[PDB]
Amino acid sequence: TITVLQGGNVLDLERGVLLEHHHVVIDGERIVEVTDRPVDLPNAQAIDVRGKTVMPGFIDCHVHVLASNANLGVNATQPNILAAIRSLPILDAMLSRGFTSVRDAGGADWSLMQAVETGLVSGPRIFPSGKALSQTGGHGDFRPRLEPCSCCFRTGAIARVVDGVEGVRLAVREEIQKGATQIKIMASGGVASPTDPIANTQYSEDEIRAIVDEAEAANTYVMAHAYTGRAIARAVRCGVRTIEHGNLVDEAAAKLMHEHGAFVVPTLVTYDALAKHGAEFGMPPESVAKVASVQQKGRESLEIYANAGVKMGFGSDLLGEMHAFQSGEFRIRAEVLGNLEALRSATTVAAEIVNMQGQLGVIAVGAIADLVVLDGNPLEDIGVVADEGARVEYVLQRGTLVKRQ
Amino acid sequence: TITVLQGGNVLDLERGVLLEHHHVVIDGERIVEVTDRPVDLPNAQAIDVRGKTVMPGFIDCHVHVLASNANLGVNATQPNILAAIRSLPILDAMLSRGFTSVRDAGGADWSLMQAVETGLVSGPRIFPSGKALSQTGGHGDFRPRLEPCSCCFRTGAIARVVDGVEGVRLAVREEIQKGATQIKIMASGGVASPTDPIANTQYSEDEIRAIVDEAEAANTYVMAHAYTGRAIARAVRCGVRTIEHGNLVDEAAAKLMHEHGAFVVPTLVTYDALAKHGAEFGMPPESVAKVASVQQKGRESLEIYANAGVKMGFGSDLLGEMHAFQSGEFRIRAEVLGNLEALRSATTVAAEIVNMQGQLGVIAVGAIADLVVLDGNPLEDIGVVADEGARVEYVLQRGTLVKRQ
Amino acid sequence: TITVLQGGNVLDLERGVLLEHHHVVIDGERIVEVTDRPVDLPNAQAIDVRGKTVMPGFIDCHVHVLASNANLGVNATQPNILAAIRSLPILDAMLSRGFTSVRDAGGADWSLMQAVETGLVSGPRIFPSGKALSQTGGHGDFRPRLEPCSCCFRTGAIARVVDGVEGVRLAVREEIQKGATQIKIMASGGVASPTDPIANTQYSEDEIRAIVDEAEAANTYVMAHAYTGRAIARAVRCGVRTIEHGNLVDEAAAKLMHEHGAFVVPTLVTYDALAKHGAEFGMPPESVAKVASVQQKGRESLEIYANAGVKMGFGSDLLGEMHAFQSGEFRIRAEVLGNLEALRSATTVAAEIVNMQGQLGVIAVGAIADLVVLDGNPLEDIGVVADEGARVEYVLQRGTLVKRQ
Amino acid sequence: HGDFRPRGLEPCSCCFRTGAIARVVDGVEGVRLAVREEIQKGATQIKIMASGGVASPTDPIANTQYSEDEIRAIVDEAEAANTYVMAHAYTGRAIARAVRCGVRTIEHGNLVDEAAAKLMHEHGAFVVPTLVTYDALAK
Ligand SMILES: [Zn+2]
Ligand SMILES: [Zn+2]
Ligand SMILES: [Zn+2]
Ligand SMILES: [Zn+2]
Ligand SMILES: [Zn+2]
Ligand SMILES: [Zn+2]
Ligand SMILES: [Zn+2]
C-alpha cells in the first residue's frame, strides 16, 4: 500500500525555498508524487502535516556508531558482545534526531548494516567502512609509547594496523569482501591517538595509491582523515575522494581539492565537545592537549572551502556520551555559511558523497522515502534542526514511519 | 601398424568444403596420407566410412573436468578421492561427444593429464591450468561474507587465493612446476562466486603483468576470466592472450583485442543451463541472481567479436549434471555465425589457442590422428554435432579407436 | 522384489558339510529362506545353481586397497588423484575373486567406503582403518635413514607418524571423526619399512593403552601389526583385539592371546610373493633382506595358534601387482589346517573380527545376501577357491548380482 | 558433541566466535589450560561433553567422550577455582564414569539405569533433565 503526507511545506534544496501546502505521495519505499493538488487518496495512510516542514532525512557522513566511550583505546578492548550492545542506543538516538543514513568511518561492519535493513535493530542505514586503515604508530594505532599486536578483530576496534603496499592491498580486498561500502584511511596524525602529533603525514604515496586503486576496482572510493594542507594535498593527488576533518587547509590545497573534485567533511562539533568534556569523559590527558589547536582554524577553514568552491558534507565524529551533541553541527555551520548551506551539507551534498545522488537527500519523484517532518522552518531558524531531536516529530525511512514524537 | 578410414568425406576447414571419397591413412599416431586414390592397403585396419563426414576431433577451450557439482564451494570441500572418482564419467562422456582435447580452466592437474595419456583413464587429452589464480574475495574465493586461511590443495578446488606481486609470481612458478600447460586467473567479478559483483575488476595491473611474465618465461600464456569491456581492456593491455566469457565487451575493447592478437572463448551454453536448472541443481540463490544479466549480451557479443575480427574459440564451462549439454554450444554459435564458424571455433581456432597449430584441429599430413566420424554433414545441419552426440559413431584418438557408437 | 538361487549345494560352515539341492531366497539385501522345499517363486529372479556350491562371500581381514605399487614409500608420494584411480582395478579384481568385504589396514578412508556403498565404484564393502598409526622411525615411517616433513594427508599414504599419549589420543579421535571403522597401529618392526628391524617393538605401553581406550570409547577395537612373541604379548596385554601377521609367536604368547580372546590374522601369501618378485617389483633391496626370515616360521606359526586355540582370520597384505595372488592364501592355509578351517577363516571367523557375527560370513535367515556361487566343492578341492577367480561364476553383494563369469 | 565439523577434513579454527556453543580441546594439559582460560574469562561453572548427543554431526549417542584422565583433570581445575563441572551424558555407562571422576551435575541423562542413578545419589550428584527440547525437536 501507500502513504500521503498531506499539506506540508516541502523543502526543495536546489532552489532554496519552502513549497507550501504540497502533498507528497509514498508508494512502497519510494516517492511517487510531489504536488499541491488535492490528491486522490483512496487507501492511503494520511498523516496530516499542515503548517510543518517536510524535508529529506539527514545524512551524517562521519560517525563512529561503535564508539561507545571516548577513549578509543579502551573502546577497542571491551568485549565483543558488550561493544555491540552499547551501539544500539547510539543508533536509536541518531535516528530520532532525524538522521536516516550514516556513513560510519570505522567500526561498523556489514552485519550492523544488515541488522537495520532487516529491521532487527532500530537506526539509520549504515554505509560501513569496516575498519579504518592505519599505519603503525598511526592515528589508528592505540598502543602506548613494545609491539607485536593482535591476530583478530575486536568488534570495538575503530581501526586496524597495516603497513606496506601488499599489506594495504590485501586489507582493502579483505574489507570489501567483508562488505564495506567505502574505504577509510588515516593519512595524517590526529587528536584521539597516543603517539602521533597532528602536523605529520601518514602512509607513503605508494600505499595510498594502492588503496585508492583497490577501492576503485570494487567501484567505490577512499575517504581520508587529514588535517594540514600538506597532508591533504598529497592524499588528494593520490586520488582520495573525500577528506575528513581538514581543519588546517591553506587555499592552495583547497584549490587543488576543487580542481580534483574532492569533497570535505568537516566535523567541528566534536572539537567543542572535547573542549568542554574532554579529560572529563575518559580521553587521555595528552589527547586533550591536541584538541586546543584544531578548533581554532576550524570555523575559519569553512570559509576557505567555500571560497575555493569545495563541496562540504555533514559530519559529527562524536565519541561516547558526547554523542548527544550530534545535531549541533548544523548550528555551527549555519553561523559561518547560510543555513541553506548547512542543510545542503546533510542532504544533497551528502547524498552525492555516498553515491546516492537522486536516491537520497532529495524530495523528488523516484527517490527513496527518507523523510523528516519538522515543526517550524529551518531555512529561517536553524534551531529547529540543531536542538537535538527537539522539534522533529515524524521520521520516515524507506516508506515506513519509524519515529513519532 | 597402420589404419585407413576409407571413402570418407573429409572436412576441410580453411576452404569450407567436404572432400568426398577421400581416404585418410593413419600410421602410429599420425596422419600420413589424405587422398581420393584407390589406396594400397596390405595390412591396414580398414574402417569403412562411406557417405559419412570425417573431421578433426573437437577441442573444448574451457572446461572444469573436476566440477562434478554446481556449487563450486561444496565441490571444493568434497573428499579428495571422491572428487577424483566423480570426474571419470565427465571425462568419458566428453570423449563420446567427440571432444578429443580439452583445456581445463582450473581443477585438473598434470596427474589427470597423465592418466589419460598412459591410457589409465578414458577421456580427452587434457591441457591443465592446475588451479586458477584469484585475489582475495575474487571469483575464486568461495568463502561466505570470518576470513580463516586454508592451504592444502583440495583436489576438488577450482582456484587458489593469492594476492600480491610476489605471491602471484611464486604461485605461477609453483603451478608450472606441478606441470600446468597455461595459467588461468580471475580478472573480474563472476557468477559462480558469493561476494563479487560482476561489474568490478580483479587484480592490480602489477599483479597481472607479473603473472603474464612468469607464464611467458615458461613459454606459455595466461587465460583470464573477464566480463566487462573495462575488465577486458586492462587484461589485454597487461598481455593476456585468451579472454574467457567476455560477454560484456564494447567494440573499443574488441578493437584492442584484435590489435593485440588476443583470442576470446565465449561460453554461452553455461548460462542457458544455469537459467533453466540454476537454483535447482544446488547453486546458491544469489549466484542465479547474477546469471540473468550476462546471457542477454551473450549472443550480441559474438557479433561484436566477429566485427572487430577477434578469433573465437569453443568453450562450455558447464558444471555438475549440466555437463550433458556440452555440444549445444555448437548450435548457439551456428545461429549467430553460421556453422562453418561454429566448427572452426572447435578445431582450427581452438588448436591455435592451445599452441598446436598444425598438430590438432586439422586433417592433414603429419597431424596427430584425432578424428571424429560423423553421420551427416555438419556444414548444412549443425544438429549432427550439436545433439548430445547422437550422430557420432567413431572417435579416434592418437591413432587408436576409442569409441564405437 | 526378490531373488532365488535354486538347487545349490549350500555350504554350512559350523557343521562342515554341503547341503545339496537347497534353495536360497533373497529379498532386498537379506536372505529370507534356506530350504530344500520346492519353493514358491512367482516373480523371483531364478538363477539356476544346480550342482554348484553356494557359500558366503569371502572376507579378507588385511588388505591395502590403495597399495598400487610395492614400494610403499613411493606409493605415498604419488599424486592424489592418481593414487585414487589406481585403486579401482584393485578393488574390482578383489570382488571378482569372491571377496565381498575387506578390512583395509591403512590407506582406504570413509569416502572410498561410500563410493562402493553408493555404487559409484565396483568392489568389496570396505571397513576402513583410515591411516595406520606409527611411531617415529616405525613400520609406517618411510623416511630414509634428516626430517622436516609433512603437513597433509596424501591419499596414497598407508600410515601417519604420531608419537606420545596426547598425540596418539588425538590421532585416534581424528581417524574416527573421519569415519574409520577400526584402528590400525604398528606395534613392532616390519619388512616394508626402511629403518626398523623386525625384532624390536614400537610404541610405549602408555601409547597403546591410550589408543585402545579411545577405540573402545568409540565402540570399536584396535588391530596391531606385530611379529615377535614379545611384541605380541605386550600388545595383547594393552588390550588390542586382533594381531596382524604374527609370524614369530611362541606358545606362551599364543596362550595369552587365547586367554584374552584376541584374534590373529596371518598373511602368509605376501611373503611368498615378496620371495619371488621382491626386488623385482621395485621394493627396496634391504626390505627384501628382511623377508627371508618371516616366511620360515610362517607356516609353523599356524600350528601354534591352532594348538593354543586362537581364532585365525583371512589376510593377504599384497602390494602392487602382487595383488593377483590374493586367493592363494586359501591353499596355503589348507595345506596346514584342514580346508574347512581355511574357509572358516574367510567367513565365520572373519565376520566375527569385523563385528558382523550373524550378518556376514554365514548363509542363514536374516543375514546379508553376500554370496559366492562356486563351480565344484571347496571342502574337497581347495583349488576351486584358491585359483584366483577361475572357478567362481556368480558373486552376489547385498542382494544384487555383481559378477557373472 | 561440541565438534560441528562435517565428516570430511580437519582444518581450522583461530578465535572464538561469539555464537559458538563449544570449543574443541583434547588432552590432559589441553583441558587443564582450557579450564583455567575459561575461569579467567569469568565462567561460574565448567561444561563438558562426556557423551555423544543429538545436535552434533558425527557422534552416535551410545558412546563416551573424553578419557577419565581428561575429565578428572577438568574436575580438579574447576574445584581449585571453587566451582564444579556440569556434564552432558545420556547412557548409564557415560554417566557412571563421569560421576566416578567427580562431576557434580549431569545434563539430560535420558538413558540411565538404576545402577548409575544409585551411584549418582551416593556421590551427591544432581541431574538436569531437559525433556521439553525433545518434544520440540520431534514436531
Ligand atoms: Zn578521523
Ligand atoms: Zn573519526
Ligand atoms: Zn570463469
Ligand atoms: Zn570457468
Ligand atoms: Zn602390517
Ligand atoms: Zn599391512
Ligand atoms: Zn547437552
XYZ file of C-alpha atoms in Angstrom, chain A residues 187-188 201 224 226-238 240 243-250 253-254 256-257 264 305:
32
model
C 46.591 9.988 6.224
C 47.788 12.267 8.996
C 51.711 12.687 7.483
C 40.865 10.013 4.301
C 43.791 14.555 7.231
C 44.342 17.961 8.911
C 47.113 20.080 7.395
C 47.175 21.315 3.796
C 50.361 19.313 3.240
C 48.624 16.115 4.382
C 45.506 16.929 2.353
C 47.253 17.836 -0.853
C 49.163 14.609 -1.153
C 46.144 12.492 -0.276
C 44.026 14.221 -2.898
C 46.656 13.838 -5.588
C 46.899 10.145 -4.765
C 41.186 10.098 -2.484
C 38.789 14.425 3.074
C 37.758 14.058 6.720
C 38.124 16.968 9.155
C 40.507 19.086 7.096
C 40.729 21.734 9.806
C 44.092 23.144 8.733
C 43.806 23.781 4.990
C 45.538 26.532 3.083
C 45.181 22.747 -1.021
C 41.604 23.974 -1.201
C 43.599 21.503 -5.555
C 40.578 19.863 -3.956
C 35.376 17.608 2.561
C 36.447 25.706 1.402
